[PDB]
Amino acid sequence: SFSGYLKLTDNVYIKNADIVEEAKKVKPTVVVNAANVYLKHGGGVAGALNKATNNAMQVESDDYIATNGPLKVGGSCVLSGHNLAKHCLHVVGPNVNKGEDIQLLKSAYENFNQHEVLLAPLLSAGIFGADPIHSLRVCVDTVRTNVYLAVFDKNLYDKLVSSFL
Ligand SMILES: O=C(Nc1cnc2[nH]ncc2c1)c1ccncc1Cl
Fold first, then answer.
1. Yes or no: is domain 6-161 CATH 3.30.70.330?
2. Which residue, 122, 124, 105, is CA-closest to 156?
């Protein structure tokens, strides 16, 4: 169902797209959220995905945290995808702006290997403060399942493709 993606490797694909609009169109089995440990979906990709669910993602997430406690940096949980996907895989990449360890980015991408196909953003990019070129390199070298990356910013998309090794 994914269309218009540039193939980077055997299993990694990329497109300049808004992941909310992509999720509404494709209705994938799994959409990845760029989550934090508290599942507080305030801004970035998480704020956008939650807004698109009319805050239902945040209501479900607050119940999950009340029962289970916070996730680990590098960890994940599977929740509903609401109106966007069958499931949302909430993945916590390190937040460099909070001083978190960038070596946890590979552990974060390992969560994707539990799902055959995913629609995802680049982990730890955007407001999480990591270099998106590094994030794409770790993604290609860690994920073995089929990943469709949506990059919101056109200028960043072009730089990611042009500099891809
Ligand atoms: O907020 C939106 N997009 C958005 C914003 N900021 C982002 N950062 N990273 C991804 C992303 C996406 C939006 C646009 C159109 N329809 C629904 C929504 Cl919820």
1. no
2. 122
